[PDB]
Amino acid sequence: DQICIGYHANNSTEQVDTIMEKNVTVTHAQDILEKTHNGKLCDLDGVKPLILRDCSVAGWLLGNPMCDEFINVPEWSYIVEKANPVNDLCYPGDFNDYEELKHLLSRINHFEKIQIIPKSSWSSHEASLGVSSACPYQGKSSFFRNVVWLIKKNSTYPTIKRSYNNTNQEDLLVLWGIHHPNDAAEQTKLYRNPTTYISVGTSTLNQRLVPRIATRSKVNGQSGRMEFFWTILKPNDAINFESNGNFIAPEYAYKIVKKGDSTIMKSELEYGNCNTKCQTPMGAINSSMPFHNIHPLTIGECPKYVKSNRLVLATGLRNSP
Amino acid sequence: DQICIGYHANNSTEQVDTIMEKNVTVTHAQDILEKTHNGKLCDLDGVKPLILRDCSVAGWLLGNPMCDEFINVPEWSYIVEKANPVNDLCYPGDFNDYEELKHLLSRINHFEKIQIIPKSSWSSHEASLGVSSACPYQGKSSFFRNVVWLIKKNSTYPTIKRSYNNTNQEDLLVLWGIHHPNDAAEQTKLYRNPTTYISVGTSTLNQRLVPRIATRSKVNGQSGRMEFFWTILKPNDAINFESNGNFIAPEYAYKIVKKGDSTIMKSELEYGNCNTKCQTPMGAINSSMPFHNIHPLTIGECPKYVKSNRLVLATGLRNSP
Amino acid sequence: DQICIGYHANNSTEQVDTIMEKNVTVTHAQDILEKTHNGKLCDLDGVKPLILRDCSVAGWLLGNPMCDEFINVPEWSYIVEKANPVNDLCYPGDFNDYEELKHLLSRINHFEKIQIIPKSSWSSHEASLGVSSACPYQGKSSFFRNVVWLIKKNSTYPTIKRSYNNTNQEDLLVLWGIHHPNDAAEQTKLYRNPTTYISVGTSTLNQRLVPRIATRSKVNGQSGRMEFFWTILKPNDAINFESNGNFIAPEYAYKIVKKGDSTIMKSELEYGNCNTKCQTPMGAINSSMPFHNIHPLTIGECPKYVKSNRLVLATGLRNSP
Amino acid sequence: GLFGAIAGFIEGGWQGMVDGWYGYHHSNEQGSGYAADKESTQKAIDGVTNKVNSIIDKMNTQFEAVGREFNNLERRIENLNKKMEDGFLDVWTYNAELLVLMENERTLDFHDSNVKNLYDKVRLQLRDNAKELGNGCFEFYHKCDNECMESVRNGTYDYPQY
Amino acid sequence: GLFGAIAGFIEGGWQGMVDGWYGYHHSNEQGSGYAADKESTQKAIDGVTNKVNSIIDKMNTQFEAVGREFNNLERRIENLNKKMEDGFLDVWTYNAELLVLMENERTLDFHDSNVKNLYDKVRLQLRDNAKELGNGCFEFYHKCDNECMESVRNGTYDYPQY
Amino acid sequence: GLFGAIAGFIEGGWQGMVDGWYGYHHSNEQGSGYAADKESTQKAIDGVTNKVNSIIDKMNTQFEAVGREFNNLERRIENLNKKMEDGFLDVWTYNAELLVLMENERTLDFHDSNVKNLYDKVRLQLRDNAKELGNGCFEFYHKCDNECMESVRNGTYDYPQY
Ligand SMILES: CC(=O)N[C@@H]1[C@@H](O[C@@H]2O[C@H](CO)[C@H](O)[C@H](O[C@]3(C(=O)O)C[C@H](O)[C@@H](NC(C)=O)[C@H]([C@H](O)[C@H](O)CO)O3)[C@H]2O)[C@H](O)[C@@H](CO)O[C@H]1O
Ligand SMILES: CC(=O)N[C@@H]1[C@@H](O[C@@H]2O[C@H](CO)[C@H](O)[C@H](O[C@]3(C(=O)O)C[C@H](O)[C@@H](NC(C)=O)[C@H]([C@H](O)[C@H](O)CO)O3)[C@H]2O)[C@H](O)[C@@H](CO)O[C@H]1O
Ligand SMILES: CC(=O)N[C@@H]1[C@@H](O[C@@H]2O[C@H](CO)[C@H](O)[C@H](O[C@]3(C(=O)O)C[C@H](O)[C@@H](NC(C)=O)[C@H]([C@H](O)[C@H](O)CO)O3)[C@H]2O)[C@H](O)[C@@H](CO)O[C@H]1O
Ligand SMILES: *[C@@H]1O[C@H](CO)[C@@H](O)[C@H](O[C@@H]2O[C@H](CO)[C@@H](O)[C@H](O)[C@H]2NC(C)=O)[C@H]1NC(C)=O
Ligand SMILES: *[C@@H]1O[C@H](CO)[C@@H](O)[C@H](O[C@@H]2O[C@H](CO)[C@@H](O)[C@H](O)[C@H]2NC(C)=O)[C@H]1NC(C)=O
Ligand SMILES: *[C@@H]1O[C@H](CO)[C@@H](O)[C@H](O[C@@H]2O[C@H](CO)[C@@H](O)[C@H](O)[C@H]2NC(C)=O)[C@H]1NC(C)=O
Ligand SMILES: *[C@H]1O[C@H](CO)[C@@H](O[C@@H]2O[C@H](CO)[C@@H](O)[C@H](O)[C@H]2NC(C)=O)[C@H](O)[C@H]1NC(C)=O
Ligand SMILES: *[C@H]1O[C@H](CO)[C@@H](O[C@@H]2O[C@H](CO)[C@@H](O)[C@H](O)[C@H]2NC(C)=O)[C@H](O)[C@H]1NC(C)=O
Ligand SMILES: *[C@H]1O[C@H](CO)[C@@H](O[C@@H]2O[C@H](CO)[C@@H](O)[C@H](O)[C@H]2NC(C)=O)[C@H](O)[C@H]1NC(C)=O
Ligand SMILES: *[C@@H]1O[C@H](CO)[C@@H](O)[C@H](O)[C@H]1NC(C)=O
Ligand SMILES: *[C@@H]1O[C@H](CO)[C@@H](O)[C@H](O)[C@H]1NC(C)=O
Ligand SMILES: *[C@@H]1O[C@H](CO)[C@@H](O)[C@H](O)[C@H]1NC(C)=O
């Protein structure tokens, strides 16, 4: 007669690593690393992302005519943007402090667009001839829908003096620009005045832009340039414009109704018609794991990202052969 | 007859955590986390901090008349500043490279103020009429005490040409500014000359400021603006001014006598009449612990900051019930 | 008769540390920290570094006449530069976005220099009188070899209008400058035109430089200043210059033939006539250790840097006295 | 293993003991079979369960990357940002892989310890009333029926009765 | 615990042993009492004291935050700086809490080990001259006075004499 | 040490055992000498070899500093960069020194464990046919020649034969 002490064994092939020994078979283990994803861009807790498709943030905000899809967009969860969107600045140029603006968007979930300076309002100057071949719509020369490219009316460009008061409660994003012509003959041809300026003032802002002339390579069939500037106009504060020419005036400005958690995701993927609690640029994650290894930049209630291919904890004991 | 082997037990209720078991009572333990502080701003090893109170660094250095308390301040250990000090730039404007200057102060323990361009010295121009309602003292219009707001004398503003040589051994902090008026009529009213400039030169510096005109919201009852610039003038080097108008000239400049360990603490607290070896924005720390959890930004011989609520080491053994 | 169980002992004096006990003698150990280096700057896998000696990157690229050694340099592995090289900008001034350029060099292993605007080419203007005492060669007044300091020819400075097309496949580094004179009398003396400008255009670039006049301390016997600018001209793109005066035009521009792993090492050491797989500013490393403690900034296949004085692993067991 | 039982003096585990991690196998006139030791098993389950939750919890606070963009003349701060975000990911990856490695080794040793302790508990009861075979088994000198077996599993095996 | 003694085969500690961590309790005709084992206790005190100083020292070099300010159009580098300083604080917090967790477990096991080793040292001396009760106690076959007890505590208990 | 053998009940090591880490010393009429235990020694060599490679490998991915320069009015981002690169070096230095400290302690304990287990393996074979001296040695009751010694080292020591 005998009694023995012993331990469990089973048909398990689960292996775990230790400091002294790799590939130790154990009776029980717990994988803690999510390795899979659905490969799609999805809504985040119901809330659809803003998928800019081929448009860039600049093309969207300034209102590139190829970006009509994104005129008055609803609340978003996150924004998606391609690495090299084709519909950026149709008319060649620069967007001043563009990254600092993009950073502001990472904290914004919704814009409401409103008109601050009506197009009809320009009685002294011409407002419906500010178009280009570089920036076409339905086969015709068009322009950034949110700003007005003003030019001389009957061979005269009188000094502009316009103000907008931010009466509404919400911070306002105001966008304007300046045109840089190719030569002195172009300057007079569009604006008459040879030496022009654009002065912009607010509580904080003290700007005075002047056109820089230079001969430049054609980009989208145009050698001229546009340089777009922006500000955030606080509540109950006014912005004051004044200019002799080269002024790309605001028509519409975006109102900041909702601020929250958001991000600008870089991804070539399109919408997937799904929902998720956790989204990455490569796809969405649905798991209760404490870790994943899909992509570092995520949004939502996510596991922690690590660079590992494998993380498995021993729960059971060394399994017998 | 028998002999037994056994171990210590006591009336201890001290608990410590382990990986496999939380709240294990032990006979002896050692807390290593300081959780308390006196809640006061104190001197650091005898040396009192500079408590700016309602003044900002800008208001202090430029010499806002509300900041007379901080005219010729003694050596400090650290500086304290409120989150939103009311006595900043009384006359609305900007302080150029302000943060880069603040960074320099984190390495400075003492300024000695000295006059480089006497107020009386301005024979060609008027120096006692450079005041404003935005920047009042004892009910009357005054101005930044360390700079002189020069204006035309008898309807003329001749070109200024002034130099200062840094003869003294210590690096010198020189402060000056430029005035931006509201319109062309204000420009002539104060300075006569319509197009003005301010050129500043040193060994390194090659500046040429010009006034930017724009119509701006009133801030502290004024729509004009001031833009303050600065430099560090090395030993045995000269700074050269030249201007047609809008020039806010230096009178006093700060001498950098002592450089050392310091910091600009953000805190709403006032002076506490205490002494300490270790100071935080929330209060001072007096302990021999290796860790604390009060606040990350500290100065002096301090324990290390962690985010923990509890760090207790087992020294003794599992205590019996 | 008896049989005993026991363990190895030897004459070893190797000690290792543990949490509970320091200086534990063991029979066997493995040092894993490299502490030594040859104290020399060496070639990296055959490929010699570019040792600028007393020249700076600026002095090299602009072509300071004291930096003739570094005219047409071969492919390098890494670059070495002193902390304070004496042969920087001979003619006093500034190098615009200099650090951003230095950063580009960390990704470059070879330049091929080529002429884009021949010196002879300047028929309308004088090109062989653009020299200074601050920037001497063989006892005579010379200048930055890669740019041409143009001045008036027979009391006239007609508007310059030059273009270069990047026909060659490789990105091109173009360098130019602007001269800032001391006064209005110097401006006319060199360039006749009182108000000048330099406009530079490419696909991306839209520049318009204007000379800033100010009275400045002499630096290397000169109060005037030069301000050097640069761009990367993409393939099949053209750069367009236009100027009334003060223009420091390109003659030679550097072609970017090879991009790879490189770095700008700060070191006072000179060439050592050695070879290595791993180089540091203090010397080179030849070891199979996983760690070293020589210097953080290294290049090549190196061990990992730590701040430790000692890292020794126990392999054997506690050795008997 | 550190404690010598699992894959040591006890060559291998038991496919036939399904209701626990550690336990007893008996052999007497009346038959044979496995019986899990509930107390030591449940104690081991709690230890490991807490370990896993402790690991998951400690790693709860950990660096999260945020998207930041920079223009063509901000290459230094772009690279700074790149090396910063990577630096943390490498630190946290290391932290995770090592913690797993270290605690895996401890978890296997923990099981070994539990088996050894259970073995020793039985050894201290039987004392001289059984022959210690050297393989995990104790061969009785007296005959031992199912009550006698159960009493060993109880902890109520009387030396004076035998 | 890993080594089976503390809260294992030795049910509980002794309120009555005040002058040490581990030791002996005796019972004979002449009386009873506790005696701490000085050697094993002091050895344990050194181990733990060094542990604590080693922990304190390793954490001596650790990230310290510095105040940095940024204007309204430097939001990216402000955020970079924020995430950088937080990242280190989270790494060092983790390092501190884990080190404590891991070494606490080791410290309790260390004490268990010291008790087990002390138990085994006595066990190897008494051998067959005493009955191993299974609870930490050895019941003598011969009568054992205070010298006889002291000799066990000495390490000078002669098997041949009894 | 945790397992009590090395510098515990076995006072010291053996200069005369050169061909292994753990082993046997015998004494009988025919002579005396050392014999390494090949199996337990090689097992220990593998464990430690893997440990070292595991340590080296885990530290393979680790922060590397890159040279970055900043002008005179970029002092904040220069300092940011300085504190960032130092922060990682301090984190990785800590990681390296601690890992060594912790695994050194484990490596010494590991050796102790191997000796204890080897001791216990022999103890379980000899059982009552030898007197357990309490110092690592077993004194035989029967006379034990070189075959008899070898059979203990074999694992083939028959209790029934003696
Ligand atoms: C009118 C015409 O057909 N001209 C032919 C020349 O082409 C024109 O070249 C000019 C300048 O050299 C412009 O690029 C013209 O393009 C536009 C554009 O952007 O599409 C035309 C727009 O109507 C005009 N819009 C406004 C509001 O002014 C726009 C702007 O002037 C410039 O962009 C400002 O920088 O320019 C282009 O059509 C052609 O070069 C020539 C043969 O060489 O033949 C001309 O008949
Ligand atoms: C003189 C007077 O009482 N004028 C009344 C107008 O008020 C004046 O409006 C002007 C410009 O519109 C200024 O703001 C005046 O304020 C001062 C100030 O800062 O206090 C007055 C100072 O003396 C003057 N100082 C100097 C050195 O010039 C200062 C500067 O000019 C400006 O700040 C430069 O930008 O301005 C203010 O008193 C009032 O607007 C009008 C009714 O609308 O009635 C006038 O009688
Ligand atoms: C011609 C001469 O000998 N003049 C004596 C004065 O010295 C001259 O002072 C001027 C301006 O005050 C310049 O610095 C002169 O230096 C040069 C230089 O850099 O070496 C001379 C160069 O030939 C000239 N080159 C060009 C292309 O113009 C250069 C430039 O003009 C300036 O650098 C542009 O800023 O200047 C220097 O020789 C002397 O000051 C005076 C006594 O005070 O006596 C004069 O005879
Ligand atoms: C428009 O913005 C101006 C500042 O440029 C702001 O002051 C106006 O608000 C009113 O200003 C009055 C003084 O001019 C002040 O008496 C009044 O309290 C204030 N109204 C409010 C609601 O704050 C703005 N115009 C409005 C609100 O019609
Ligand atoms: C004032 O600053 C000038 C530079 O702008 C500096 O050179 C002066 O110092 C003196 O300059 C002399 C040349 O002009 C030189 O011969 C003399 O050695 C030098 N003196 C010293 C002490 O360095 C400065 N003026 C002074 C010191 O009176
Ligand atoms: C010079 O650079 C111009 C742009 O400024 C570039 O377009 C030239 O290349 C050629 O341009 C032609 C149009 O003007 C085009 O028809 C042709 O395909 C193109 N050639 C190539 C090889 O791309 C450049 N000049 C050249 C290459 O001689
Ligand atoms: C554990 O098992 C033993 C033996 O099976 C139990 O002792 C028996 O208990 C039954 C039921 O109460 C009695 O009728 C018998 O007389 C006992 N037999 C013997 C041989 O002791 C014992 O009660 C159990 N103890 C536990 C679970 O603590
Ligand atoms: C430890 O204790 C034993 C017993 O108390 C000591 O042996 C006695 O020592 C005394 C004093 O020297 C002698 O007079 C007695 O004859 C001894 N009695 C017995 C029964 O041995 C012993 O010397 C001590 N050894 C130590 C502390 O190492
Ligand atoms: C280990 O050693 C024992 C004793 O030396 C071996 O037993 C002997 O084996 C030899 C050679 O085969 C025989 O001729 C003898 O008759 C045996 N003698 C005794 C006393 O047993 C045994 O075979 C070995 N076993 C191993 C290595 O597993
Ligand atoms: C462990 O197993 C993996 C996959 O099964 C294999 O690729 C690897 O080489 C093994 N590693 C070792 C150290 O045996
Ligand atoms: C441990 O004790 C604390 C405070 O005494 C209590 O709040 C906590 O819930 C306990 N934790 C566990 C896991 O028992
Ligand atoms: C260990 O040894 C070193 C050098 O041999 C010595 O300087 C140090 O003080 C010793 N440390 C301890 C804790 O004994």
mmCIF file of all heavy atoms in Angstrom, chain A residues 216-218, chain C residues 164-168 203 235-240, ligand 6:
data_model
loop_
_atom_site.group_PDB
_atom_site.id
_atom_site.type_symbol
_atom_site.label_atom_id
_atom_site.label_comp_id
_atom_site.label_asym_id
_atom_site.label_seq_id
_atom_site.Cartn_x
_atom_site.Cartn_y
_atom_site.Cartn_z
ATOM 1 N N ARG A 216 8.894 82.911 -60.097
ATOM 2 C CA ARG A 216 8.838 81.580 -59.522
ATOM 3 C C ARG A 216 8.433 80.547 -60.553
ATOM 4 O O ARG A 216 7.727 80.852 -61.512
ATOM 5 C CB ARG A 216 7.819 81.560 -58.384
ATOM 6 C CG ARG A 216 8.108 82.556 -57.275
ATOM 7 C CD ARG A 216 6.900 82.739 -56.379
ATOM 8 N NE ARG A 216 5.965 83.737 -56.901
ATOM 9 C CZ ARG A 216 5.855 84.996 -56.469
ATOM 10 N NH1 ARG A 216 6.625 85.466 -55.496
ATOM 11 N NH2 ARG A 216 4.959 85.802 -57.023
ATOM 12 N N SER A 217 8.870 79.312 -60.331
ATOM 13 C CA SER A 217 8.472 78.192 -61.168
ATOM 14 C C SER A 217 6.958 78.038 -61.127
ATOM 15 O O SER A 217 6.332 78.267 -60.090
ATOM 16 C CB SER A 217 9.139 76.903 -60.685
ATOM 17 O OG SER A 217 10.542 77.071 -60.560
ATOM 18 N N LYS A 218 6.367 77.672 -62.259
ATOM 19 C CA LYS A 218 4.943 77.386 -62.299
ATOM 20 C C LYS A 218 4.676 76.157 -61.447
ATOM 21 O O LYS A 218 5.429 75.186 -61.487
ATOM 22 C CB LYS A 218 4.449 77.147 -63.730
ATOM 23 C CG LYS A 218 4.249 78.416 -64.541
ATOM 24 C CD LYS A 218 3.782 78.100 -65.956
ATOM 25 C CE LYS A 218 3.566 79.360 -66.777
ATOM 26 N NZ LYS A 218 4.820 80.140 -66.968
ATOM 27 N N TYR C 164 19.080 79.321 -62.571
ATOM 28 C CA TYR C 164 19.744 78.039 -62.751
ATOM 29 C C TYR C 164 18.734 76.903 -62.692
ATOM 30 O O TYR C 164 17.887 76.860 -61.805
ATOM 31 C CB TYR C 164 20.845 77.812 -61.723
ATOM 32 C CG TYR C 164 21.421 76.427 -61.847
ATOM 33 C CD1 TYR C 164 22.306 76.109 -62.873
ATOM 34 C CD2 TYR C 164 21.038 75.416 -60.976
ATOM 35 C CE1 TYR C 164 22.820 74.831 -63.007
ATOM 36 C CE2 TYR C 164 21.545 74.134 -61.100
ATOM 37 C CZ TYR C 164 22.435 73.846 -62.112
ATOM 38 O OH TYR C 164 22.930 72.565 -62.219
ATOM 39 N N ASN C 165 18.850 75.985 -63.645
ATOM 40 C CA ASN C 165 17.986 74.826 -63.742
ATOM 41 C C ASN C 165 18.732 73.609 -63.226
ATOM 42 O O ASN C 165 19.839 73.326 -63.677
ATOM 43 C CB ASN C 165 17.601 74.611 -65.201
ATOM 44 C CG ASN C 165 16.502 73.582 -65.378
ATOM 45 O OD1 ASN C 165 16.608 72.448 -64.919
ATOM 46 N ND2 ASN C 165 15.442 73.978 -66.066
ATOM 47 N N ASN C 166 18.134 72.894 -62.279
ATOM 48 C CA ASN C 166 18.735 71.671 -61.768
ATOM 49 C C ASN C 166 18.461 70.523 -62.727
ATOM 50 O O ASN C 166 17.479 69.791 -62.574
ATOM 51 C CB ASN C 166 18.205 71.338 -60.371
ATOM 52 C CG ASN C 166 19.015 70.250 -59.685
ATOM 53 O OD1 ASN C 166 20.177 70.025 -60.020
ATOM 54 N ND2 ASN C 166 18.409 69.581 -58.709
ATOM 55 N N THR C 167 19.327 70.389 -63.727
ATOM 56 C CA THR C 167 19.188 69.342 -64.738
ATOM 57 C C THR C 167 19.675 67.996 -64.212
ATOM 58 O O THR C 167 19.016 66.974 -64.418
ATOM 59 C CB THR C 167 19.967 69.683 -66.020
ATOM 60 O OG1 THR C 167 21.344 69.919 -65.698
ATOM 61 C CG2 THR C 167 19.382 70.911 -66.677
ATOM 62 N N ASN C 168 20.837 67.998 -63.559
ATOM 63 C CA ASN C 168 21.374 66.785 -62.916
ATOM 64 C C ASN C 168 20.413 66.116 -61.916
ATOM 65 O O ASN C 168 19.615 66.788 -61.266
ATOM 66 C CB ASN C 168 22.755 67.036 -62.277
ATOM 67 C CG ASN C 168 22.871 68.394 -61.608
ATOM 68 O OD1 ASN C 168 23.968 68.941 -61.504
ATOM 69 N ND2 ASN C 168 21.754 68.942 -61.150
ATOM 70 N N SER C 203 10.173 76.478 -56.877
ATOM 71 C CA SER C 203 8.884 75.811 -56.692
ATOM 72 C C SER C 203 8.266 76.198 -55.369
ATOM 73 O O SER C 203 7.077 76.493 -55.290
ATOM 74 C CB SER C 203 9.064 74.293 -56.693
ATOM 75 O OG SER C 203 9.768 73.873 -57.840
ATOM 76 N N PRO C 235 15.216 68.076 -58.081
ATOM 77 C CA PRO C 235 15.556 67.803 -59.486
ATOM 78 C C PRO C 235 14.573 68.451 -60.445
ATOM 79 O O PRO C 235 13.376 68.500 -60.160
ATOM 80 C CB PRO C 235 15.476 66.274 -59.598
ATOM 81 C CG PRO C 235 14.722 65.809 -58.397
ATOM 82 C CD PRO C 235 14.890 66.847 -57.330
ATOM 83 N N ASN C 236 15.086 68.962 -61.562
ATOM 84 C CA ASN C 236 14.249 69.488 -62.632
ATOM 85 C C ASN C 236 13.532 70.781 -62.223
ATOM 86 O O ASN C 236 12.527 71.160 -62.826
ATOM 87 C CB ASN C 236 13.236 68.413 -63.062
ATOM 88 C CG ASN C 236 12.853 68.507 -64.524
ATOM 89 O OD1 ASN C 236 13.470 69.228 -65.304
ATOM 90 N ND2 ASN C 236 11.828 67.760 -64.906
ATOM 91 N N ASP C 237 14.061 71.455 -61.206
ATOM 92 C CA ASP C 237 13.490 72.700 -60.702
ATOM 93 C C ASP C 237 14.517 73.809 -60.868
ATOM 94 O O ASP C 237 15.725 73.557 -60.847
ATOM 95 C CB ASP C 237 13.110 72.548 -59.225
ATOM 96 C CG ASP C 237 12.465 73.804 -58.638
ATOM 97 O OD1 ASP C 237 11.817 74.567 -59.389
ATOM 98 O OD2 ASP C 237 12.588 74.016 -57.410
ATOM 99 N N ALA C 238 14.030 75.035 -61.027
ATOM 100 C CA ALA C 238 14.889 76.185 -61.267
ATOM 101 C C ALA C 238 14.820 77.167 -60.108
ATOM 102 O O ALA C 238 13.775 77.314 -59.473
ATOM 103 C CB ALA C 238 14.487 76.871 -62.564
ATOM 104 N N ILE C 239 15.945 77.829 -59.841
ATOM 105 C CA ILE C 239 16.002 78.930 -58.873
ATOM 106 C C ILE C 239 16.223 80.257 -59.611
ATOM 107 O O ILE C 239 17.066 80.334 -60.504
ATOM 108 C CB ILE C 239 17.097 78.708 -57.803
ATOM 109 C CG1 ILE C 239 16.962 79.746 -56.682
ATOM 110 C CG2 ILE C 239 18.497 78.757 -58.409
ATOM 111 C CD1 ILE C 239 17.798 79.440 -55.461
ATOM 112 N N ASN C 240 15.465 81.286 -59.232
ATOM 113 C CA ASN C 240 15.457 82.570 -59.942
ATOM 114 C C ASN C 240 15.880 83.729 -59.054
ATOM 115 O O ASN C 240 15.179 84.067 -58.102
ATOM 116 C CB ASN C 240 14.055 82.875 -60.457
ATOM 117 C CG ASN C 240 13.520 81.801 -61.375
ATOM 118 O OD1 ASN C 240 14.166 81.437 -62.356
ATOM 119 N ND2 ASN C 240 12.325 81.294 -61.070
HETATM 120 C C1 LIG G 6 14.329 73.105 -66.313
HETATM 121 O O1 LIG G 6 13.363 73.264 -65.297
HETATM 122 C C2 LIG G 6 12.068 73.422 -65.834
HETATM 123 C C3 LIG G 6 11.122 73.949 -64.761
HETATM 124 O O2 LIG G 6 11.529 75.251 -64.410
HETATM 125 C C4 LIG G 6 11.689 72.047 -66.367
HETATM 126 O O3 LIG G 6 10.337 72.004 -66.770
HETATM 127 C C5 LIG G 6 12.613 71.703 -67.535
HETATM 128 O O4 LIG G 6 12.339 70.385 -67.961
HETATM 129 C C6 LIG G 6 11.500 70.315 -69.139
HETATM 130 O O5 LIG G 6 10.417 71.231 -69.151
HETATM 131 C C7 LIG G 6 9.603 71.188 -70.312
HETATM 132 C C8 LIG G 6 8.521 72.263 -70.215
HETATM 133 O O6 LIG G 6 9.114 73.540 -70.175
HETATM 134 C C9 LIG G 6 8.970 69.805 -70.459
HETATM 135 O O7 LIG G 6 8.258 69.710 -71.676
HETATM 136 C C10 LIG G 6 10.031 68.711 -70.411
HETATM 137 O O8 LIG G 6 9.399 67.456 -70.321
HETATM 138 C C11 LIG G 6 10.961 68.890 -69.217
HETATM 139 N N1 LIG G 6 12.063 67.942 -69.298
HETATM 140 C C12 LIG G 6 12.277 66.984 -68.390
HETATM 141 C C13 LIG G 6 13.459 66.082 -68.610
HETATM 142 O O9 LIG G 6 11.564 66.811 -67.401
HETATM 143 C C14 LIG G 6 14.088 71.843 -67.147
HETATM 144 N N2 LIG G 6 14.884 71.931 -68.366
HETATM 145 C C15 LIG G 6 15.436 70.916 -69.058
HETATM 146 C C16 LIG G 6 15.285 69.484 -68.614
HETATM 147 O O10 LIG G 6 16.092 71.126 -70.085
#
